[PDB]
Amino acid sequence: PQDLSEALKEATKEVRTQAENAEFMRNFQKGQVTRDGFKLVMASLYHIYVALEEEIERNKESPVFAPVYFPEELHRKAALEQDLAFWYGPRWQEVIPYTPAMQRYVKRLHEVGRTEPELLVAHAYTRYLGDLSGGQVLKKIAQKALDLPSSGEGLAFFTFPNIASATKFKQLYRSRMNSLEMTPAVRQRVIEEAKTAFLLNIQLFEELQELLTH
Template sequence: MDTMKSARKDDAGEVGSDLSEQIKAATKDNHVRAENTQLMLSYQKGQITLVQYKVLLCSLYEIYKALEEELDRNASHPAVAPIYFPQELARVESLERDLEHFWGSEWRKKVIVPAATQRYGQRLRKIGRENPELLVAHAYTRYLGDLSGGQVLGKITQKSLGLISKDGLSFFQFPGVSSPNRFKQLYRSRMNSIELTEEEKAAVLEEAVLAFELNIQVFDDLQKMLSVATETVNQPSDRFPAAILRSSPILQYTVGLCLALATIGVGIYAL
């Protein structure tokens, strides 16, 4: 309930009763934290590498796969139906094209994500089964973020990676949306029309805060994983037997990443 109360006002005064406005107010601090992580700042500066982008795609795929499967399964739920736009917004097929472009036809065998990404997916599947109305918070946070920052980050990614064509950048493209701004207005209007009890609305606001926290945890997990691998790579060879490396595919993967990365950049998109 604390989030519900804090969402009623912003710095300028009353926020209003619209769910979209209340979510924006409730997640304001979390949004600032996410935007100012080293990961997001690096991305905005155009300091993303191909390996960073490939790792980002892997986590995004797992997150969107869980989200969209639950949205599809609950498409007729009264809280989900108004904001269900699979033709316009679905990202899974776009991510699959990007992953195949960069990883090859057997990309599914190469996808590795941190534990935090798995927890994110598990949370989406849990609420999809038990409290489908909470999917509204995740759909709003992700899709409107993609529409708001997708074009800019798409250009940054293309320039940073030196890509001549749009191949590998399908995630940032929304061919079913002719005007992102008009579509966002429609989406907010549909979301604000959802009938929720005060208790359900408070739960949605709490879930929106959690959505940002889950994203931040993904970033932190990636950084920790790579930090450990970097320290391992920097150790003398006699302190890190080759047999141990050969026996651990995950460690092989993280060590390989560290040879290419100093930091790992993952984007959070402004609402």
């Protein structure tokens, strides 16, 4: 389609289904998820969102990203910090895993930010809009399954306190995405990078699932 947002949606439909039908995620959806499992994804999200947001900050003033820069509304690093402190204790920093699939994702994010900032929007879209749209569904699953203490922390990641309405925000985001001017060369690269992002996720889930069964 003409609009980037639509083109991304449709171009990635295959990999997104593959991504949502990864075993780990399938079991997540069906309600089967363990504490160790949850601790792992949260640790992954941290590494990922640290890298992503590091590179967003690097390129926030560039024309190729500035229009989709919404720091207050989207930033996840902090909430992840809050959550990991809960899940892993005060020395979470030192004791959280950093598996090869996490490195591979972190690595790509940095190579994009440093040398292809024009593609960064692919990852921003993939992650933020994804987690926004599939958050609140995951979240509910997690609390029923993980049978948590009434300690009032652990799931901050699944709430974007500065976005009153998701639907309004998604539209505004898409609008801004589609405002981005780019050559057809770049546009296809961006579409591919989005597929890449889904794969990096897919392989990460395969990796986590492998670890959890051993």
